[PDB]
DNA sequence: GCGAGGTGTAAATTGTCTGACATGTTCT
DNA sequence: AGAACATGTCAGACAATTTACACCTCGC
């Protein structure tokens, strides 16, 4: 199930999954993205173990780009985890019509920004 | 006070509490129960209440007294901004193309349908 | 070759929960 | 009063990161 995976994870690793749901990336690129989110330096000694653990849970694929660089991407299971937490979040945020119109505005602005 | 400064370091558990309260304010054990539905297993109240207290001191949750054994927890304005800021983050990374988006659109549509 | 890029890794510190015991309250 | 309801609290146990050192690789 997507849920039994999406629960459990630490905030740090669900943020890793969100980042990878935008695009597959190599390790230090994930690192910089998380530094922009947290507004703090992110220790690589924290990130690599956590990507490793997301791999043994089958939510992240670790392929080789260089002999010094790895690319990390979402497996179909990690994607289902992302979607499941997004569904839970929206299920509880869209509690009335103004909440829906708010989400619709966010999504429409995002879409427009894809340009 | 920016919720981004206070809510991006929260634990997953605390974020889920904010999510639950985003739907509507609830008393303690009602939060416990809805969390238990999300997690599929029991949530120890000795874990819940101290994290509600931490969210309260961070200015994201308000603790009122319904009766003198029961407390009602509810988002402050900053707690609502924390929920919205996290949702905007998740979305800005998820809405990567037209199909990801229409997926979100149908999710929201079904949610609005459940409210009738 | 040399420096910078990319990742691996773990002991000690720090962060958090578990698994309780516990006190007042509302109900019948 | 008896019993479930609601929350308070925390020490022992567990989960996590910090802060280093470390090894190989690509770029110039
Ligand atoms: Mn940075
Ligand atoms: Mn680093
Ligand atoms: Mn829209
Ligand atoms: Mn976060
Ligand atoms: Mn917590
Ligand atoms: Mn309990
Ligand atoms: Mn945010
Ligand atoms: Mn936005």
Cβ–Cβ < 8 Å for B39, A88: no
The residue assigned the tokens 């304010």 is B25
Q: Report resolution in angstroms.
A: 2.0
Cross-chain residue pair B101–A111, CB shorter than 8 Å: yes
- Which residue range(s) make up the domain with B17? 1-116
Specify the experimental method.
X-ray
Of the candidates A49, A21, A85, A48, the residue with the CA atom closest to the CA atom of residue B19: A85
Ligand with an atom nearest the CA of residue A47: 2
Q: How far apart are CA B43 and CA A46, in angstroms?
A: 27
Cβ–Cβ < 8 Å for A94, B112: yes
Cite the DSSP H helix spans in chain B: 4-7, 12-23, 28-39, 45-57, 77-94, 98-115
Q: Considering only residues 32 to 71 of chain B, which have any Cβ-Cβ distance to chain A shorter than 8 Å?
A: 38-40
Any atom of strand D under 7 A from CB of B19? no
Q: How far apart are CA A72 and CA A23, in angstroms?
A: 9
Residue nearest to nucleotide D15 (CA to C1'): A10
Q: How far apart are CA B6 and CA B82, in angstroms?
A: 8
Size of interface A-B (CB pairs under 8 A): 101
Distances, alpha carbon B48 to alpha carbons A100, B36, B45, B69, in Å: 29, 11, 5, 16
Q: How far apart are CA B62 and CA B29, in angstroms?
A: 16
Q: How far apart are CA A59 and CA A46, in angstroms?
A: 18
H or E element in which residue B41 lies: none
Look at chain B and report how many structural domains it folds into: 1
Q: How far apart are CA A78 and CA A59, in angstroms?
A: 4
């Amino acid at each position: 199930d997507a849920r039994s995976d999406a629960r459990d994870l630490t905030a740090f690793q669900k943020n890793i999954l969100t980042v990878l749901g935008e695009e597959a990336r190599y390790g230090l690129a994930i690192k910089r993205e998380l530094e922009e989110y947290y507004g703090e330096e992110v220790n690589h000694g924290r990130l690599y173990p956590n990507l490793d653990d997301l791999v043994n849970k089958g939510l992240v694929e670790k392929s080789e780009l260089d002999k010094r660089t790895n690319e990390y991407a979402l497996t179909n299971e990690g994607f289902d985890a992302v979607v499941d937490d997004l569904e839970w979040t929206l299920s509880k945020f869209v509690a009335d019509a103004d909440r829906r119109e708010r989400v619709e505005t966010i999504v429409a602005d995002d879409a427009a920004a894809l340009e």
